[PDB]
Design a protein around this ligand. Structure first.
Ligand SMILES: CCCCCCCCCCCCCC(=O)SCCNC(=O)CCNC(=O)[C@H](O)C(C)(C)COP(=O)(O)OP(=O)(O)OC[C@H]1O[C@@H](n2cnc3c(N)ncnc32)[C@H](O)[C@@H]1OP(=O)(O)O
Ligand SMILES: CN(C)CCCN(C)c1nc(N(C)CCC#N)c2cc(Br)ccc2n1
Ligand SMILES: [Mg+2]
Length: 411
């Protein structure tokens, strides 16, 4: 059924995944010397292009390709509209490898036709705790801990083929070439997410949304007035009331993160994340890049009390093109990013996120049920969306885990 994925070092069935007990690579070890130096063959009318992320023009070209040809909902109502500033932020973290950004251009006119992006990530991806002590019960502890140390791997995002070139087996070629460029740097694993089911996810989480400006959401049919709201008249008055938030944060001590916060944010994030089976490890430089506030892009607040950062939350902005619609062109969504609470209940920290998101003009807050995201769903009036984010490894055998054991937020 899978002409491409069947040729690949990923688990091939849900069973394979359910059986696995130890984290480890699938393929036998190779060396950089084993990997072809020459790019993978491509039709003579196309050429491989490595965009420059330091070039506004290259970013612009990538932006346009994604604006018109990237992820849409199942009903072709909405298409994500990642901004140019967002892409520069996502695509160029500290110590990024320019080579891992892989594009196909039409030779004739240099039109961008397809793209895929790899970024470095340090990831804890050793045997999960629930399989690890079961390994102890069976006297298999060292095997279970072989790959406990954080690995410097590749995170894949932004795979996109132009609508005109779809279903011509171009995506497999992109994946092959990306794999090559990554292998050539002595990296053998990748982590990636998708909304579609491919072979074979190690975890899957539902999406959740929290209406911030329900009038607009209903105008654009992101939301339908639930059947039940029509037992009164003015069900848009009641809906508004339902989703109403304060104008100002409730937690004193709440302010924007600043550069001097970096070491303390790092400490408390790392302590929180380390309790999860799969999760990133960040340098100070990475904490700076991913969490310092950045206009239109990422928004980060700390609770400091007595010159001490005790809690933080972050969200990032991804608008979507509303595909028709006379009244509206854009849906303004806040996504829950990294956070940590140590002095207050998480539901109280995240309410403040919602309050801030709302004040600054976001229409909705979204998230996946990873981290401790489930704890605040009901109180904060999140509802489960359609579809799921599926988490995958390339070349890494890994047991099925619950989404609540995953600490890697994907952009
Ligand atoms: C060590 C380093 C390793 C580095 C690489 C790690 C792996 C990277 C993995 C990529 C992670 C990306 C993570 C994200 O960015 S997820 C976001 C993906 N982007 C979109 O959904 C945007 C709109 N869609 C498109 O642009 C295209 O429809 C795409 C490009 C998705 C497929 O193009 P197209 O529709 O023109 O089809 P084709 O004829 O070229 O090819 C058909 C083959 O493609 C397989 N397919 C379909 N969708 C996906 C998908 N989302 N991930 C992986 N594979 C996918 C499919 O099963 C089939 O293979 P097989 O079933 O025949 O075997
Ligand atoms: C962590 N994260 C979901 C980032 C993804 C942002 N995007 C593009 C996104 N994607 C979504 N999907 C792919 C759902 C399709 C399935 N299965 C998505 C789905 C919903 Br529902 C709400 C927000 C979303 N936002
Ligand atoms: Mg294709």
């Amino acid at each position: 059924a899978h002409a491409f994925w069947s040729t690949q070092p990923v688990p091939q069935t849900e069973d394979e995944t359910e059986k696995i007990v130890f984290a480890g690579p699938m393929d036998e070890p190779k060396t950089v010397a084993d990997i072809p130096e020459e790019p993978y063959p491509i039709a003579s009318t196309f050429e491989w292009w490595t965009p420059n992320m330091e070039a506004a023009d290259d970013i612009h070209a990538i932006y346009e390709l994604l604006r018109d040809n990237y992820v849409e909902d199942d009903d072709s109502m909405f298409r994500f509209n990642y901004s140019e500033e967002f892409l520069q932020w996502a695509l160029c973290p500290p110590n990024y490898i320019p080579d891992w950004h892989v594009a196909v251009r039409r030779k004739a006119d240099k039109k961008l036709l397809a793209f895929i992006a790899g970024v470095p990530v340090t990831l804890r991806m050793g045997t999960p705790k629930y399989m690890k002590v079961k390994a102890q019960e069976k006297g298999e502890g060292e095997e279970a801990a072989k790959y406990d140390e954080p690995r410097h791997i590749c995170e894949i995002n932004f795979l996109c083929v132009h609508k005109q070139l779809r279903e011509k087996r171009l995506a497999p070629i992109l994946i092959k070439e990306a794999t090559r460029r990554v292998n050539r740097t002595n990296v053998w694993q990748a982590v990636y997410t998708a909304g579609v089911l491919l072979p074979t996810p190690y975890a899957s989480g539902q999406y959740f949304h929290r209406s911030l400006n329900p009038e607009k959401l209903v105008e654009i049919r992101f939301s339908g007035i639930p059947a039940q709201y029509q037992k009164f008249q003015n069900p848009m008055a009641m809906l508004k009331r339902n989703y109403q938030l304060p104008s100002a944060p409730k937690n004193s001590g709440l302010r924007e993160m600043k550069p001097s916060d970096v070491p303390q944010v790092r400490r408390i994030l790392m302590n929180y994340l380390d309790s999860f089976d799969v999760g990133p490890v960040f340098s100070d430089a990475e904490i700076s890049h991913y969490l310092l506030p950045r206009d239109g892009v990422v928004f980060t607040y700390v609770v400091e009390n007595d010159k001490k950062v005790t809690d933080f939350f972050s969200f990032y902005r991804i608008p979507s093109t509303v595909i028709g619609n006379s009244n509206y062109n854009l849906l303004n969504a806040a996504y829950v990013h990294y956070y940590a609470a140590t002095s207050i209940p998480l539901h109280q920290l995240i309410l403040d996120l919602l309050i801030v998101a709302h004040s600054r003009g976001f229409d909705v807050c979204n998230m996946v049920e990873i981290l401790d995201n489930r704890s605040f769903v009901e109180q904060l009036k999140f509802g489960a969306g359609d579809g799921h984010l599926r988490y995958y490894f390339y070349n890494w055998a890994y047991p099925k885990i619950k989404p609540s054991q995953v600490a890697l937020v994907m952009l």
